[PDB]
Design a protein around this nucleic acid. Structure first.
Lengths: 189, 132, 62, 138, 314, 65
RNA sequence: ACGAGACUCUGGCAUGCUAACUAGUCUUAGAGGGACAAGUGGCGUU
C-alpha cells in the first residue's frame, strides 16, 4: 500500500542500477500525489534544479505577464484531460511517454569565446540536467507556438507533456533545432 | 561573511584563558557559562562569543593554539621543559674526529685522550654547490 | 563517442569578455582513472557528476 | 486539562476541537469533495486513504476554519489534522505508536510543519517599489 | 571491585536526560527531565523483549529547569527554572496544580523542604531568606552570608532528621540545625569551584563536587578537615548507597567509583560503540541511576541513546 | 549608542561681525545608579570578573593553638 | 582613537508563558527564548 498515486506503484518499476535516477526519482518524501507543493524555485541557485522534473515542466510554462506563476493554471491543466486519458487509454502511454523526448535530448550547447567575436560559439556540454531543462524550456516555447496563434490549445496536450516527461528515445522538434545547433557548435571540436 | 570581529575574538580568548575550567564544548553550555561569567551587553554578541569559544575549544582539544596561555597546557609544556635524559648525549665513548681537529687538540694540550677516533677525511674537495 | 561518467574535482570559474563559460576538472571512473579539464555552461554543483560523451574535448585555459 | 493546538498557516486558521465520542470524521462542515474552487480537491484525500478508518475511529473533531487564500486555508487543514492527530496519539495511548504514525505522515511531505516566511517588504526610498527607482534623467 | 555488563540497547527519544530522582515509597512514578520543553515517564521492566515503553510525555515547562526534587512521597513534583519561577505537579489531577512567579531575580535553584515548614530560594541580594506558605517574612540573615550566589539548600535524602545544608558556587558550605543557625567556623581560599553539595544519609560526611574534583569532607559540628577525595572534571552527580557506605560519580565519559577505605578505582571495564569516522566525537556522561539498590545501572548521553547495564555487585 | 551616550548642543553666538555657530558634543561616562551616566554600557564592551591572587600550600591542614 | 561591525527599529518561530463580558491559548503586546557558520563532510603554513 505504498503505491505511488492511485494507479502506479514503486514496488516493480526498477532499473537494478542506482545511478540512472537523474530524471525519475521516486524513493523518498519528494514524491507528489499532486505537484502543487507550493514553494519557491529562485531563492538560491541549484534550488531550481532541485525542482522535480514534473513540477518544473508544469510550472516553467508561466510566461507573458498575465499567466505568470499562477499555480492554479498549472494544477488545473495537469488534472484536466489527465483524469480523462487515464481511463480512456487502458493501455500504457509508456512507449511514446518516454521515447519522444527523454532521449530526443541534445548532448551539447555553445558558449562565448575570447574577448570579442559574435560569429561562432565554442562547443561545450553540461551534465545532462541543465541541457535537458534548457531543451524543456524551449519545448515549452514550442508548445506555446503550437498553441499561440495555432489550433491545438493549452490543457489538451497531456500526451505531449507525458512525452516531455518520461524516459529515453528521440522524436522532438525544438530538440532537433537544438541538435542542429549542436552540430553547428560541434563543428569546432 | 561570518568573520568574527576583534571584539568577539578578544572576548572569547580572555574568557577561555580565565575560566577554562567551567567552559566546555556543547553550545548550550558555552552560552550558559558565558552569560554567567561575562557581562555581555547584547544577546547576539553573546551567542557570537559563545560560538567562537566553542570553535577555540575544538582548536585546543587537538593541540595548542598560540593565542591562549591556559594554566594546564602551559604546566604540561613546562613539565616537558624540565625533561632530562638518563644518559647525557655528550657522554659519547667514541667521538669521530678528523685529522685537523685532532691536530688542534694536540696543540690544545689534549692529545692523550683516547676517545677521539681519528677518521679518514673525505678525499673530494667538492663542497660548494654548482653555479647557474 | 563513449558516454563516460566522471567526478568533478575542482571548479575553476568563469571566462568571457563579460563572463559566459565555466571551467571544471573531471576525473574518470573506469578508464584508467586520470584527470582532465573541460569547460561547461550552466549550473554544475560542488562535486557533481559529468558525462563525457566524448573523450577528447579539451578547453583552452586563459 | 486543555490539550488543544489548532492549526494555523500563513493568514488562515482552523480551531480543531478534538475529543472522545462516537468516533466519526466531519471535515469542512460540507460534503467531502464538492468544494467550490475545485482547485485542490485531490490533495485533501491523502490522509483519509493513507491512514484508514480504524486509526480515526474514536476521534470527534470540530473545526472552525477561516481564511482567504487557497494556499492559506488549504495546507492549513493538513497541518491541523496532522498536529491534532499527533497530539491525540501522544496524550491518549503512547509515544512509540505516535512516532510511527507521525513519521509516516510527515515523511509523506515536509511543508506540514513549516509555513512560508516570505512577506511583502516595505516600499523603499525614492522609487515606486521596494527596489525599483524613479527613472534618472541625465 | 564490581562487575557489570551492557545487555541491551534503547533507541528512540527526543530529550536527553538532565536530572534524576526517585522515591522508595512510590515506585510507580519515574521521570527524566529534558531541555526541549519535555519530560519522559518510565517503568521498570528488565526484559530483553521489552526494556522500555514510552507512556507519558510530561509537558508544561516554559523554560529549562535547573533542579527537580521530590518530597518523601512520590506524589509532588516541584520544579524551578533559571528564572525564579516555580511549578508544582500533582498526580491527583494530572495537570498544573500550583504555579508561582514571585522571585524577580535570576534564581538558579528551587527546593522543597522535607518537613514542609519553610521554603528557601537563591536571591542576588547577598542574603538568604526563609519563607512560609502564608506569604510573610520569617527569618532574614544579613550578616556573615555567602560571598556570592547561593546554589541551593538540602536536607537528608532518606527519612531521618532535617539538617539544613546551604551550598553555593562560591565554594562556601554551611550546616545548620533548625534552632541556632550560627556560623561557627569559616574557611576560604579554594582552588576550584563548587557545583553542588550532597547530604549523606548516615550523617557523618559532606562530600563536594566541582571542576577541581577535591571531595572536601567536613564533620557536622564544626569544619574540621577530614579528606579531599580525588576527582576529575566538573562533578555533577553525587550520592551514597541508601543502605551502604560507598561513593560514585561520572566526572566525564568514564565511571569513577570509590570505597572510603581504598579511595581509588579498582577496574575500569566499559563498553563503547565503534565509529568508522575518526573525527566523530563521542557524547558525555553526567549521572548514574541505580535501579533500586545497585543491582542494575542506567545512564544517558547526547547521542539520543540511553545506556543500561546489569550489575552483579559481587 | 550616540542617542544615549552623546549629547550635542548647537548654538549661535552673535558677534558684531557675524554669527558663529558652536557645536559641542560630549559623551557621558558609564556609571550605574545616580543618573550621572547612561545605565547601559557600550554594546561592544565585554566585561569580565577579576579573580584574586591564589598562592596556597599543597594541602589545607587545620591549625590549633 | 574614530569609521566598519556591534547597536536601535523592522518582519520571520512556539503540542511554551504573563491575561482581555469587542476574538475562544488564533487578534493584541511580554520580563523573555531562538541562529551561532552551530552539527557533520569537503577545501584551507589544515
Amino acid at each position: 500500500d505504498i503505491k505511488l498515486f492511485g494507479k502506479w506503484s514503486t514496488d516493480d518499476v526498477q532499473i537494478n542500477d542506482i545511478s540512472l535516477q537523474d530524471y525519475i526519482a521516486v524513493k523518498e518524501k519528494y514524491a507528489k500525489y499532486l505537484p502543487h507543493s507550493a514553494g519557491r524555485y529562485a531563492a538560491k541557485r541549484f534550488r531550481k534544479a532541485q525542482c522535480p522534473i514534473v513540477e518544473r515542466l508544469t510550472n516553467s510554462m508561466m510566461m507573458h505577464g498575465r499567466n505568470n506563476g499562477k499555480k492554479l493554471m498549472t494544477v488545473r491543466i495537469v488534472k484536466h484531460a489527465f483524469e480523462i486519458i487515464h481511463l480512456l487509454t487502458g493501455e500504457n502511454p509508456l512507449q511514446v511517454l518516454v521515447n519522444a523526448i527523454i532521449n530526443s535530448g541534445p548532448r551539447e550547447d555553445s558558449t562565448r569565446i575570447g574577448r570579442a567575436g559574435t560569429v561562432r560559439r565554442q562547443a561545450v556540454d553540461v551534465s545532462p540536467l541543465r541541457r535537458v531543462n534548457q531543451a524543456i524550456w524551449l519545448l515549452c516555447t514550442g508548445a506555446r507556438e503550437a498553441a499561440f496563434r495555432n489550433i491545438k490549445t493549452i490543457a489538451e496536450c497531456l500526451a505531449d507533456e507525458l512525452i516531455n516527461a518520461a524516459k529515453g528515445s528521440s522524436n522532438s522538434y525544438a530538440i532537433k533545432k537544438k541538435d542542429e545547433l549542436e552540430r553547428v557548435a560541434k563543428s569546432n571540436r | 561573511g561570518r568573520v568574527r570581529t576583534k571584539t568577539v575574538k578578544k572576548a572569547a580568548r580572555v574568557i577561555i584563558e580565565k575560566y577554562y575550567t567551567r567552559l566546555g564544548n556543547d553550545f548550550h553550555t558555552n552560552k550558559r557559562v558565558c552569560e554567567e561569567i561575562a557581562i555581555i551587553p547584547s544577546k547576539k554578541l553573546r551567542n557570537k562569543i559563545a560560538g567562537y569559544v566553542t570553535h577555540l575549544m575544538k582548536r585546543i582539544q587537538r593541540g595548542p593554539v598560540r593565542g591562549i596561555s591556559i594554566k594546564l597546557q602551559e604546566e604540561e609544556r613546562e613539565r616537558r621543559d624540565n625533561y632530562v635524559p638518563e644518559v647525557s648525549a655528550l657522554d659519547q665513548e667514541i667521538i669521530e674526529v678528523d685529522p685537523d681537529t685532532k691536530e688542534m687538540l694536540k696543540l690544545l694540550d689534549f692529545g692523550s685522550l683516547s676517545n677521539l677516533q681519528v677518521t679518514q677525511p673525505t678525499v673530494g674537495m667538492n663542497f660548494k654547490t654548482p653555479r647557474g | 563517442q563513449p558516454i563516460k561518467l566522471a567526478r568533478v574535482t575542482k571548479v575553476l570559474g568563469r571566462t568571457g569578455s563579460q563572463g559566459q563559460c565555466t571551467q571544471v576538472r573531471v576525473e574518470f571512473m573506469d578508464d584508467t582513472s586520470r584527470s582532465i579539464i573541460r569547460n561547461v555552461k550552466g549550473p554544475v554543483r560542488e562535486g557533481d557528476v559529468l558525462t563525457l560523451l566524448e573523450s577528447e574535448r579539451e578547453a583552452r585555459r586563459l | 486539562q486543555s490539550v488543544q493546538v489548532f492549526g494555523r498557516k500563513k493568514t488562515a486558521t482552523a480551531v480543531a476541537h478534538c475529543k472522545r465520542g462516537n468516533g466519526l470524521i466531519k471535515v469542512n462542515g460540507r460534503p467531502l469533495e464538492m468544494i467550490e474552487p475545485r482547485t485542490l480537491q485531490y490533495k485533501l484525500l491523502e490522509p483519509v486513504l493513507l491512514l484508514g478508518k480504524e486509526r480515526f475511529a474514536g476521534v470527534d473533531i470540530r473545526v472552525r476554519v477561516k481564511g482567504g487564500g487557497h494556499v492559506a486555508q488549504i495546507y492549513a487543514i493538513r497541518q491541523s489534522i496532522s498536529k491534532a492527530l499527533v497530539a491525540y496519539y501522544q496524550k491518549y495511548v503512547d509515544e512509540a505508536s505516535k512516532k510511527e504514525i507521525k513519521d509516516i505522515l510527515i515523511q509523506y511531505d515536509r511543508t506540514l510543519l513549516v509555513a512560508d516566511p516570505r512577506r511583502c517588504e516595505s516600499k523603499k526610498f525614492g522609487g515606486p517599489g521596494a527596489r525599483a527607482r524613479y527613472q534618472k534623467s541625465y | 571491585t564490581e562487575q557489570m555488563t551492557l545487555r541491551g540497547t534503547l533507541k528512540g527519544h527526543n530529550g536527553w536526560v538532565t536530572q534524576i530522582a526517585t522515591t522508595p515509597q512510590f515506585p510507580d512514578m519515574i521521570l527524566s527531565a529534558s531541555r526541549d520543553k519535555t519530560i519522559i515517564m518510565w517503568k521498570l521492566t528488565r526484559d530483553e523483549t521489552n526494556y522500555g515503553i514510552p507512556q507519558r510525555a510530561l509537558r508544561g515547562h516554559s523554560h529549562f529547569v535547573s533542579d527537580v526534587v521530590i518530597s518523601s512521597d512520590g506524589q509532588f513534583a516541584l520544579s524551578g527554572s533559571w528564572d525564579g519561577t516555580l511549578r508544582l505537579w500533582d498526580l491527583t489531577t494530572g495537570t498544573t496544580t500550583r504555579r508561582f512567579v514571585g522571585h524577580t531575580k535570576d534564581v538558579l535553584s528551587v527546593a522543597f523542604s522535607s518537613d514542609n515548614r519553610q521554603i528557601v530560594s537563591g536571591s542576588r541580594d547577598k542574603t538568604i531568606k526563609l519563607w512560609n506558605t502564608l506569604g510573610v517574612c520569617k527569618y532574614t540573615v544579613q550578616d556573615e552570608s555567602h560571598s556570592e550566589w547561593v546554589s541551593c539548600v538540602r536536607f537528608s535524602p532518606n527519612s531521618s532528621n532535617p539538617i539544613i545544608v546551604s551550598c553555593g558556587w562560591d565554594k562556601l558550605v554551611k550546616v545548620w540545625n533548625l534552632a541556632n543557625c550560627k556560623l561557627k567556623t569559616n574557611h576560604i581560599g579554594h582552588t576550584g569551584y563548587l557545583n553542588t553539595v550532597t547530604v549523606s544519609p548516615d550523617g557523618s560526611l559532606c562530600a563536594s563536587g566541582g571542576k577541581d574534583g577535591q571531595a572536601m569532607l567536613w564533620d557536622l559540628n564544626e569544619g574540621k578537615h577530614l579528606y579531599t577525595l580525588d576527582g576529575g572534571d566538573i562533578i555533577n552527580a553525587l550520592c551514597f548507597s541508601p543502605n551502604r557506605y560507598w561513593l560514585c560519580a561520572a566526572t566525564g565519559p568514564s565511571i569513577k567509583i570509590w570505597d572510603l577505605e581504598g579511595k581509588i578505582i579498582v577496574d575500569e571495564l566499559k563498553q563503547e560503540v565503534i565509529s568508522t569516522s575518526s573525527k566523530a566525537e563521542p557524547p558525555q556522561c553526567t549521572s548514574l541511576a541505580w535501579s533500586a539498590d545497585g543491582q542494575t545501572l542506567f545512564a544517558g548521553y547526547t547521542d539520543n541513546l540511553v545506556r543500561v547495564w546489569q550489575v552483579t555487585i559481587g | 549608542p550616540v542617542n544615549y551616550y552623546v549629547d550635542t548642543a548647537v548654538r549661535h553666538v552673535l558677534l558684531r561681525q557675524g554669527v558663529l555657530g558652536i557645536k559641542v558634543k560630549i559623551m557621558l561616562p558609564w556609571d550605574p545608579t545616580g543618573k550621572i551616566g547612561p545605565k547601559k554600557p557600550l554594546p561592544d564592551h565585554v566585561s569580565i570578573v577579576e579573580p584574586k591572587d591564589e598562592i596556597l600550600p599543597t594541602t589545607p591542614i587545620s591549625e590549633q593553638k
